[PDB]
Amino acid sequence: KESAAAKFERQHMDSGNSPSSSSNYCNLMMCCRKMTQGKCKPVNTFVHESLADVKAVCSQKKVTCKNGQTNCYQSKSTMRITDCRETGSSKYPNCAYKTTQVEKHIIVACGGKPSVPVHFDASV
Amino acid sequence: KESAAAKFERQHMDSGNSPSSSSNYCNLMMCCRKMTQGKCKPVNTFVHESLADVKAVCSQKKVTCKNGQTNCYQSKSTMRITDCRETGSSKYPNCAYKTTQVEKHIIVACGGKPSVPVHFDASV
């Protein structure tokens, strides 16, 4: 039971001077995509390329994953990605993230048949 | 349940959208603030002023509500707001919103004690 005053805040309040600024993207996306449920996921990367292109990475350069497995693949081209990293004073239930827009190659773990991306390992 | 591939799309994929895209603000906010959970709320307004300023409207101009309720008050000044409206192509689970920023006087329905804003009535 959320009070009616808390419901009003949640549904209608977003105090700030540049509410749609690119710096607020991670706070809003981490929330939307359920990565702040019961805890604040510390780091997470969003890829802004088409799914078909990220799926094709599973048939490109095979590399070793961070954990020693060898079912990781690196994209032959760089991709537009956004890195979201918790800000130092971020504490559940007030998760806060810094948004970083870069262009790097991505390394994903591919699984299943057909092979598709199941984990995001690193960007380089 | 959510498959490993689906989980990867939810955590890492945001194709055709960018952090700098201010027209995607309503899509991010309606999702994050839980207004696309089970249905797509048709319309909604976010107020960008401080909460103290919005709380103060309950002691400003008493007016007749425009949307079937009572105890409505209008702000003596205009406020920075964002109107979110479903796009004609919107259908749960794929809600989509059009984002409009404007500055208008807001009308809220107050309740409780102390009297605080419990419903957003209209912008004039």
Curated annotation (Swiss-Prot), chains A, B:
Residues noted as binding substrate in the record, renumbered to the chain: K7, R10, K41, P42, V43, N44, T45, K66, R85
Class in the EC hierarchy, top level: lyase
Catalytic-site annotation from UniProt: H12, H119
GO cellular component: a single term: extracellular region
Coiled coil: none
Cysteines engaged in disulfide bonds, as pairs: C26-C84, C40-C95, C58-C110, C65-C72
Residue(s) carrying Deamidated asparagine: N67
Superkingdom of origin organism: Eukaryota
EC number: 4.6.1.18
GO terms of biological process kind: defense response to Gram-positive bacterium
Subcellular location: Secreted
Catalytic activity of the protein: an [RNA] containing cytidine + H2O = an [RNA]-3'-cytidine-3'-phosphate + a 5'-hydroxy-ribonucleotide-3'-[RNA]; an [RNA] containing uridine + H2O = an [RNA]-3'-uridine-3'-phosphate + a 5'-hydroxy-ribonucleotide-3'-[RNA]
Tissues expressing this chain: Seminal plasma. Can reach 3% of the protein content of this fluid.
Regulation: Allosteric regulation by both substrate and reaction products.
Family per record: Belongs to the pancreatic ribonuclease family.
Miscellaneous comment as given in the Swiss-Prot or TrEMBL entry: Progressive deamidation of Asn-67 transforms the homodimer (beta- 2) into and heterodimer (alpha-beta) and finally a doubly deamidated dimer (alpha-2).
Function according to Swiss-Prot or TrEMBL: This enzyme hydrolyzes both single- and double-stranded RNA.
Subunit structure: Homodimer; disulfide-linked.
UniProt protein name: Seminal ribonuclease
UniProt organism field: Bos taurus
Gene: SRN
Segment of the intact protein contained: 27 to 150 of 150
